[PDB]
Amino acid sequence: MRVIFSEDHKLRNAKTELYGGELVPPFEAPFRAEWILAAVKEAGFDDVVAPARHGLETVLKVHDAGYLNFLETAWDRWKAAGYKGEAIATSFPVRRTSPRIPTDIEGQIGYYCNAAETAISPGTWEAALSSMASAIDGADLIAAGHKAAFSLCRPPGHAAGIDMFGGYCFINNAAVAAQRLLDKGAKKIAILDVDFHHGNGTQDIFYERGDVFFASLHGDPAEAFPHFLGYAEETGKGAGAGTTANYPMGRGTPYSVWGEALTDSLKRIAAFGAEAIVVSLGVDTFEQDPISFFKLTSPDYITMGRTIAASGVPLLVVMEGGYGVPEIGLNVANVLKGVAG
Amino acid sequence: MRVIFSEDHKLRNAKTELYGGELVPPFEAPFRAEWILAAVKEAGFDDVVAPARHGLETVLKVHDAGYLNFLETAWDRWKAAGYKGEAIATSFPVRRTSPRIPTDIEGQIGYYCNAAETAISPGTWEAALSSMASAIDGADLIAAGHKAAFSLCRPPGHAAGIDMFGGYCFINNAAVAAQRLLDKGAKKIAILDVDFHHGNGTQDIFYERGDVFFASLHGDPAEAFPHFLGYAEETGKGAGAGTTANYPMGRGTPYSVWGEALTDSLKRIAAFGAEAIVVSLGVDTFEQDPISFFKLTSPDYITMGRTIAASGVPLLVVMEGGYGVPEIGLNVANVLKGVAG
Ligand SMILES: CC(=O)NCCCCNCCCN
Ligand SMILES: CC(=O)NCCCCNCCCN
Ligand SMILES: [K+]
Ligand SMILES: [K+]
Ligand code: NA
Ligand code: NA
Ligand SMILES: [Zn+2]
Ligand SMILES: [Zn+2]
Residues from chain A contacting residue B234 (CB–CB below 8 Å): 98
Interface test with A, best of B92, B206, B233 (most A CBs within 10 A): B92
Q: Which residues contact A82 (CB under 8 A, 6 or more apart)?
A: B20
Helix (H) or strand (E) holding B5: strand B2-5
Residue A266, amino acid:
L
Ligand 2: centre distance to CA B170 (Å): 13
Which chain A residues are within 8 Å of B164, Cβ to Cβ?
Answer: 94-95
Torsion of CA B318, B324, B326, B332, to 10 degrees: -20
What residues does the ion ligand 7 have nearby, CB within 5 Å? A 195-197, 282, 284, 321
Nearest ligand atom owner, CA of B246: 4
Distance, CA of A156 to chain centre: 5
H or E element that contains A261: helix A255-272
DSSP state string for B171-224: S-HHHHHHHHHHHTT-S-EEEEE-SSS--HHHHHHHTT-TTEEEEEEEE-TTSS
Q: Within 10 A of A132 (CB to CB), how many other CB atoms are there?
A: 29
Please tell me what DSSP assigns to residue A216: E
Q: Which residues on adjacent β-strands are paired with residue A257?
A: none
Residue ranges making up the domain that contains A80: 1-341
Nearest CA to ligand 2 atom 6: B167
| Distance (Å, whole) CA A228 – CA B310 | 48
Q: Decide: B159 in ligand 2 pocket, CB within 6 A.
A: yes
State which amino acid sits at residue B105: I
Which secondary-structure segment (H or E) carries B339?
helix B327-340
- Give the helix/strand (H/E) hosting A181: helix A173-183
> What residues form DSSP beta bridges with B296?
B286
- Interchain contact, B102 vs A223, CB within 8 Å: yes
The dihedral built from the CA positions of residue B204, B210, B213 and B219, taken in this order, carries a sign that is: positive
- Does residue B43's CB lie within 6 angstroms of at least one atom of ligand 2? no
Distance CA B240, CA B62 (A): 14
Task: Compute, in angstroms, the gap from residue A165 CA to the centroid of ligand 5.
Answer: 20
Q: First and final CA of chain B: distance in angstroms? A: 11
Domain count, chain B: 1
Indicate left, alpha or beta for B227 from its phi (over 0: left) and psi (-120 to 50: alpha).
left
Distance between Cα A166 and ligand 1 center (Å): 9
What is the rounded distance in angstroms from the CA atom of residue A139 to the CA atom of residue A164? Answer: 23
Nearest one of B340, B338, B320, B334 to B33, comparing CA atoms: B320
What is the full DSSP assignment across B120-159?
Answer: B-TTHHHHHHHHHHHHHHHHHHHHHT-SEEEEE-SS--TT
Q: Which residue, among A228, A233, A237, A292, would best test binding to B if mutated, counting the most B CBs under 10 Å from its CB?
A: A228
Residues B96, A207: C-beta atoms closer than 8 Å = yes
Cβ-based neighbour number of residue A30 at 10 Å: 15
CA B229 to chain centre: 15
Taking an 8 Å cut-off on Cβ atoms, the answer to whether A114 and B91 are in contact is: yes
Q: Are A139 and A131 in contact (CB under 8 A)?
A: no
Q: How far is CA B94 from CA A222, B151, B229, in A?
A: 16, 34, 14
Q: How would you classify residue A90: left for phi > 0, otherwise alpha for psi between -120 and 50, otherwise beta?
A: alpha
CB A282 within 8 A of CB A218: no
Alpha-carbon span A159 to A59, nearest angstrom: 15
For residue B38, give the 3-state DSSP assignment.
Answer: helix
Atom of ligand 2 nearest to the CA of B158: 1
* B chain contacts of residue A240, beta-carbon cutoff 8 Å: none
Q: Is B117 in the pocket of ligand 2 (CB under 6 A)?
A: yes
Query: Where do the DSSP E strands lie in chain A?
Result: 2-4, 17-19, 22-24, 48-49, 148-151, 189-193, 212-219, 244-249, 253-254, 277-281, 294-295, 315-319
> Does B197 contact ligand 2 (Cβ within 6 A)?
yes
From the number of C-beta atoms within 10 Å of its C-beta (0-12, 13-18, 19+), residue B129 rates as buried
A97: DSSP letter: -
Nearest CA in chain B to A121: B21
The residues, ordered by sequence, that sit 6+ positions from A166 with a Cβ below 8 Å of its Cβ are A113, A114, A115, A116, A117, A118, A159, A160, A201, A226, B91
Q: Rounded distance, CA B264 to CA A95, Å? A: 29
- Give the contacts of A193 (CB within 8 A, at least 6 positions apart): A158, A174, A199, A202, A214, A215, A216, A217, A218, A279, A280, A282, A320
Q: Is B167 in the pocket of ligand 2 (CB under 6 A)?
A: yes
In sequence order, what are the residues at sequence separation of 6 or more whose Cβ sits closer than 8 angstroms to the Cβ of residue A45? A1, A3, A150, A333, A336
As a residue count, chain A comes to 341
Measured distance CA(A43)–CA(A282) in Å, rounded: 18
Distance CA B274, CA B186 (A): 9
Other Cβ atoms closer than 10 A to A319: 34
Residue B115 CA to residue A254 CA, distance in Å, equals 37
Residues 6+ apart with CB under 8 A from B310: B266
**Separation of CA A203 from chain center:** 11
Of A83, A100, A164, the CB nearest to B231: A100
CB A15 within 8 A of CB A26: yes
Resolution of this deposited model, Å: 2.3
CA A113 to CA A172: how far, in whole Å?
14
Task: State the first-to-last Cα distance of chain A, in angstroms, to the nearest integer.
Answer: 11
Going from the C-alpha of A43 to that of each of A48, A212, A332, B285, the distances in angstroms are: 13, 32, 10, 64
For A271, residues 6+ apart whose C-beta sits below 8 A from its C-beta are: none
Q: What is the CATH number of the domain that holds A69?
A: 3.40.800.20
Concatenating the DSSP letter of every residue in B65-78 gives: HHHHHHHHHHHHHH
Residue nearest atom 5 of ligand 2, based on CA coordinates: B167
